[PDB]
RNA sequence: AAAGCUGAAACUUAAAGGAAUUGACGGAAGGGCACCACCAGGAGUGGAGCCUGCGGCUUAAUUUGACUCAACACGGGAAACCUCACCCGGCCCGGACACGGACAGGAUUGACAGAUUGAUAGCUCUUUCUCGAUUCCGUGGGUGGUGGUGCAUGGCCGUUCUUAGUUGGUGGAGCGAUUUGUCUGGUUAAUUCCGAUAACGAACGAGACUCUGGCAUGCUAACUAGUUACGCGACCGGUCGGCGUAACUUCUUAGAGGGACAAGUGGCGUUCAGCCACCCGAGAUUGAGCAAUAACAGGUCUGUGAUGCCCUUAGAUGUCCGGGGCUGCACGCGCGCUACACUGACUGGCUCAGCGUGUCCUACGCCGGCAGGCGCGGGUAACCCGUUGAACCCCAUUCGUGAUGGGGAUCGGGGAUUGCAAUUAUUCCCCAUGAACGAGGAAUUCCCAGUAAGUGCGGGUCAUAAGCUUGCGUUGAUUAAGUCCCUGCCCUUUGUA
């Protein structure tokens, strides 16, 4: 939670339009889960995605 | 398994083997008991073997009857 | 009389139950939607032979994952060896590093011959030679895996789900889960807009966007693209993909920029969003790619040096080498290919592509009936193959309703190309053999215009190589412009144990 939020706060401080940080796997217990964290604006479809959002 | 066991070949340990190569007399006749290997690199450095009915060199794999 | 009134216990149990909220579901209702739905049809498939992929029965092993849409020509899975996991048999360490022992008075390495073995494997036995602290023996500790678990996981991927869905902030309503915003009604392919309005401001999806088709006798250009003209030549003013110069860009390549917006006209529409028709036009809906929120105990540990646990780890589940198997057939299913002929076969003649690939693609000459054999050239490619002389189709010939010159399965001989190796026949060619099949029962798939279907060609696999898929042209239709009846989908009302 703290680590991912630290990264969000820094990315939004740096001056991005919006951020999406996702962490997936054995977060707690023996069952695989996923935690998505979103802020600002984020586009998913069309050509603009190619040259407006960068992913890792 | 059907076979009892397959054992690896262990080299028969011989003590001080190079004393069998020379036969030095009291006044000093240094005679080579085993024959010399007549090949190029072996010449004067390798003493070719003497089996029961043949000769053999361990380096160059040269054989004579 | 049927029965009425009054009326316990032993034992047994963690809930039974009441209101209201979200979902899901209904053989409940109201709107709308889709050829993985029907209607009208087209081609079919299901019947036949054969190819492949699955179950079974065999086997030494027939390695194995996947089982409605969301398994079964799927794992890019066309397996002769390799691949290769599986079965039989045999070499190798490629067991780092540390500690102890061993040890130049030699730890250890490799091997001729004969036996041994499938093997010219010093693998092992007999017999000796040969290398020089690199090893070899014990414990700890590693390192490998197409070993196990996808129900421990990451990543991609498929599906729910191709429909229009989805969520905060602040304000409002409820003790509360929660709800409103996200809507009565019109309108759209669309939670798309108009307009209502306890909501107002927003965000994602949709749209926009990117690639591709269709138009430019306007623009910039061109011996790796062509035309027009002229000269020379060949043969009768004409034919030339016969050759050489000059104007250019119509044809060819492809950069920039134009062009289409319900814009113009007439109806219909709370004259609003918009809908139908028509003129002018190349075009008045081209085809894709990308695709939210929230989930499948969906598939994959056999893509990985992506990976946690566990199992083995030197007579190994490591790795390699010889074989065999993956294809083994009383049977049942799933994609398909060729057919059942006369709108057709056969023989000859004529005449047109497009995508895209070549360090293996191939022109030209010679020999062989053919598969192919030799010799000598071009091309790392708008340069050579190549003007990619493709097939259906078109025009002649023969056949004649006969299981027939339809169909070419199954079988016998030969002759070539790959490859170290072709038998359980890898492909390829020639002669011979000539099965079922006369349009397929219940059932069931796909599809709306350059579409369906017929028909070839290129790419991927590829030493050998397409009955597969992924693309490209070519010839080119019938029927519909609708509906919720079947099968499902979205929104709104209700009902629920
Ligand atoms: Zn020698």
Curated annotation (Swiss-Prot), chain A:
Methylation by PRMT1 is required for import into the nucleolus and for ribosome assembly. Disulfide bonds: none annotated. Coiled coil: none annotated. The modification N6-succinyllysine is found at residue 17. It is found in: Cytoplasm; Nucleus; Nucleus, Nucleolus; Mitochondrion inner membrane. It comes from the Eukaryota. Component of the small ribosomal subunit. The ribosome is a large ribonucleoprotein complex responsible for the synthesis of proteins in the cell. Has endonuclease activity and plays a role in repair of damaged DNA. Cleaves phosphodiester bonds of DNAs containing altered bases with broad specificity and cleaves supercoiled DNA more efficiently than relaxed DNA. Displays high binding affinity for 7,8-dihydro-8-oxoguanine (8-oxoG), a common DNA lesion caused by reactive oxygen species (ROS). Has also been shown to bind with similar affinity to intact and damaged DNA. Component of the 40S small ribosomal subunit. Identified in a IGF2BP1-dependent mRNP granule complex containing untranslated mRNAs. Interacts with HNRPD. Interacts with PRMT1; the interaction methylates RPS3. Interacts with SUMO1; the interaction sumoylates RPS3. Interacts with UBC9. Interacts with CDK1; the interaction phosphorylates RPS3. Interacts with PRKCD; the interaction phosphorylates RPS3. Interacts with PKB/AKT; the interaction phosphorylates RPS3. Belongs to the universal ribosomal protein uS3 family. This is Small ribosomal subunit protein uS3. It comes from Homo sapiens (Human). The lineage of its organism: Eukaryota, Metazoa, Chordata, Craniata, Vertebrata. The gene is RPS3. The chain holds residues 116 to 171 of 243 of the full protein.
From Swiss-Prot, chain B:
It comes from the Eukaryota. It is found in: Cytoplasm; Nucleus, Nucleolus. A zinc finger (C4-type) spans 37-60. The modification N6-acetyllysine is found at residues 20, 29. Monoubiquitinated at Lys-23 and Lys-29 by RNF25 in response to ribosome collisions (ribosome stalling): ubiquitination promotes subsequent activation of RNF14, leading to EEF1A1 ubiquitination and degradation and rescue of stalled ribosomes. Deubiquitination at Lys-29 by USP16 is required for maturation of the 40S ribosomal complex. There is a cross-link at residues 23, 29 (Glycyl lysine isopeptide (Lys-Gly) (interchain with G-Cter in ubiquitin)). Part of the 40S ribosomal subunit. Part of the small subunit (SSU) processome, composed of more than 70 proteins and the RNA chaperone small nucleolar RNA (snoRNA) U3. Component of the 40S subunit of the ribosome. Part of the small subunit (SSU) processome, first precursor of the small eukaryotic ribosomal subunit. During the assembly of the SSU processome in the nucleolus, many ribosome biogenesis factors, an RNA chaperone and ribosomal proteins associate with the nascent pre-rRNA and work in concert to generate RNA folding, modifications, rearrangements and cleavage as well as targeted degradation of pre-ribosomal RNA by the RNA exosome. This is Small ribosomal subunit protein eS31. The chain holds residues 85 to 149 of 156 of the full protein.
């Amino acid at each position: 939670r703290r680590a991912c939020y630290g990264v969000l706060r820094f990315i939004m401080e740096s001056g991005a339009k919006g951020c999406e940080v996702v962490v997936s796997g054995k977060l707690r217990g023996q069952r695989a889960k996923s935690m998505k964290f979103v802020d600002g604006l984020m586009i998913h479809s069309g050509d603009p995605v190619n040259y407006y959002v960068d992913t890792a | 398994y059907t076979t009892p066991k397959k054992n690896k070949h262990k080299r028969k340990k011989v003590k001080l083997a190079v004393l069998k190569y020379y036969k030095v007399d009291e006044n000093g006749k240094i005679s080579r008991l085993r024959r010399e290997c007549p090949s190029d690199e072996c010449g004067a450095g390798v003493f070719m073997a003497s089996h029961f009915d043949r000769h053999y060199c361990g380096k160059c794999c040269l054989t004579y009857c």
